[PDB]
């Protein structure tokens, strides 16, 4: 293979691997912030649905 | 496969073909009791299927083409050299005894499968309940050791407790002198060397150990030498019996189904025949069994499963 061939192939490999490394570091930091806060689409542990609540007038009014 | 739990669920109940003719019969006796023909007579008046006596080569006759295999593949022992040399060092005696018990267990499995699948009774010769008595003669003449008897009783304890005793067991009273006279008139050059106390102890363990336990779990019909020669005598004395003894009565479709599922797996039948109890008469080593097994691979039709052999001319292997 040519030296230009191997050289520019090496540069494409380095671009792809540096992008994957920066995105893995972003992946770690995003998981850290979402487990710390819980504001993102991940780590939404389930709570009670608010559609189950009976909104009709009940028997006694003290409720 | 042919039978399983699905066919039992889909209506094949084993008491749809359990009639009064379903009588598993076994004719016991000494070496030359005139009984080996008599079983055929009991086979040819009651309309039953005769199994011959399981020698070394019973499993050789069941699977494959049925020709007699060489002795180094099956048993690796001898009966003639047992008769010439009962007190050998290499242990022809217990090796031949254990191989005969394995062959008779396969014979009894085939008998129960034919009986529980075809509705036709099977006439055996010297079934597995009448095998250990021969071991006792080989213990009463000093042919084997105590550890071989312990090994055989462990094997028979773990193999016979899952079966049933037969319906009718025929026993033949021939005294020792008439057995010896028929041996001498046979002219068999190896059979003549059998000692007399061996045969007397065969008769003693017949009368004192076999029949005091089988008479309560099957039905005895004890015949002498002269009355075991008429066929219709023994046939009709089977034909008018009142069957209450034995564990054949408390058997429904479920228990006979579990027996039939145990029987039709022949490797599960023969699973604990060769238990790993290290005994010098039966333990065949690594390279010897390796050489004999790689020669068994080269036997014609024996390399693959029973419909996957081009050397015997099997068709459609590439669609099986």
């Amino acid at each position: 293979d040519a030296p230009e061939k191997n050289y520019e192939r090496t540069m494409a490999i380095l671009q792809i691997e540096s992008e994957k490394a920066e995105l893995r570091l972003k992946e770690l930091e995003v998981r850290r912030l979402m487990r710390a806060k819980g504001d993102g689409p991940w780590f939404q542990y389930p709570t009670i649905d608010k559609a189950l609540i009976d909104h009709s007038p009940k028997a006694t009014p003290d409720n | 496969l042919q039978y399983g739990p699905l066919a039992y669920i889909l209506g094949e109940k084993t008491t749809k073909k359990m009639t009064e003719n379903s009588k598993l019969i076994t004719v016991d006796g000494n070496i030359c009791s005139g009984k080996s023909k008599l079983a055929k007579e009991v086979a040819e008046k009651l309309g039953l299927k005769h199994f011959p006596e399981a020698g070394i080569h019973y499993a050789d006759s069941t699977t494959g083409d049925g020709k007699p295999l060489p002795v180094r593949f099956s048993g690796n022992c001898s009966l003639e050299k047992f008769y010439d040399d009962p007190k050998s060092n290499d242990g022809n005696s217990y090796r031949l005894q254990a191989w005969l018990y394995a062959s008779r267990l396969l014979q009894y499995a085939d008998a129960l499968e034919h009986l529980l699948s075809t509705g036709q009774g099977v006439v055996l010769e010297r079934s597995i309940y009448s095998d250990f008595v021969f071991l006792e003669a080989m213990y009463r003449q000093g042919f084997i050791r105590k550890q071989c008897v312990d090994h055989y009783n462990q094997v028979k304890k773990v193999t016979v407790c899952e079966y049933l005793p037969p319906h009718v067991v025929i026993y033949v009273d021939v005294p020792v002198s008439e057995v010896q006279s028929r041996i001498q008139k046979k002219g068999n050059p190896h059979e003549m060397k059998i000692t007399s106390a061996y045969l007397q102890d065969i008769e003693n363990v017949y009368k004192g150990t076999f029949l005091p336990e089988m008479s309560e779990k099957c039905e005895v019909l004890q015949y002498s030498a002269w009355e075991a020669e008429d066929a219709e005598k023994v046939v009709e004395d089977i034909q008018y019996l009142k069957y209450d003894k034995g564990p054949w009565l408390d058997q429904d479709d479920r228990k006979l189904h579990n027996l039939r599922m145990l029987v039709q797996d022949k490797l599960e039948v023969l699973n604990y025949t060769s238990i790993p109890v290290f005994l010098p008469e039966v333990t065949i080593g690594a390279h010897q069994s390796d050489r004999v097994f790689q020669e068994f691979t080269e036997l014609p039709g024996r390399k693959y499963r029973a419909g996957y052999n081009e050397d015997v001319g099997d068709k459609w292997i590439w669609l099986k």
Binding site: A59, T60, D62 | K255
Partner: protein, 175 residues
């Protein structure tokens, strides 16, 4: 002291549990658990649990009669222990009694106690309702709705009882 009536019935409840928890013999175990179950429907019935306390009375009476039949049939020795035959029964029996009256003495002195949770020492007359329930006891309507809302609960409970019968017939077959 009379306002502590659910407390007093619950002291009898714990005393019955000490009585059959030292395991003297299942005859006297049946006695102690009949006493504890019979005051269980004195504890829970002073809340409004008429039906739902009578059930834990009745089902446990059937249970202790069957338990009697088995401990008379299979679980019987020659000298059954009353409570005082073995020393190791009576020691932990007296231990349970003095430890229960120890925490009684600690809860009627301080009116607060904490074994791991925190418990008031005033009687449980304070925690009731000041309202009416109309022409129905509310727990009777709740167990009446076992057939209206609770469809899946009825299905799985009937299937569990069915296969419990089948399981027990497959176990006590012997072969």
């Amino acid at each position: 002291m009379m306002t502590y009536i659910v407390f007093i019935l619950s002291i009898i409840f714990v005393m019955g549990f000490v009585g059959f928890s030292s395991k003297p013999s299942p005859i006297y175990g049946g006695l102690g658990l009949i006493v504890s179950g019979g005051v269980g429907c004195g504890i829970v019935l002073n809340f409004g649990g008429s039906f739902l306390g009578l059930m834990v009375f009745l089902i446990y009476l059937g249970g202790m009669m069957v338990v009697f039949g088995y401990t008379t049939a299979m679980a019987t020795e020659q000298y059954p222990e009353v409570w005082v035959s073995n020393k190791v029964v009576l020691g932990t029996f007296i231990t349970g009694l003095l430890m229960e009256f120890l925490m009684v003495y600690y809860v009627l002195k301080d009116k607060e106690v904490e074994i791991v949770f925190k418990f008031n020492g005033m009687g449980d007359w304070v925690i009731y309702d000041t309202g009416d329930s109309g022409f129905f006891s509310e727990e009777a309507m709740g167990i009446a709705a076992l057939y209206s809302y609770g469809t899946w609960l009825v299905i799985v409970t009937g299937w569990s009882l069915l296969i419990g019968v089948v399981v027990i017939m497959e176990i006590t077959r012997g072969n």
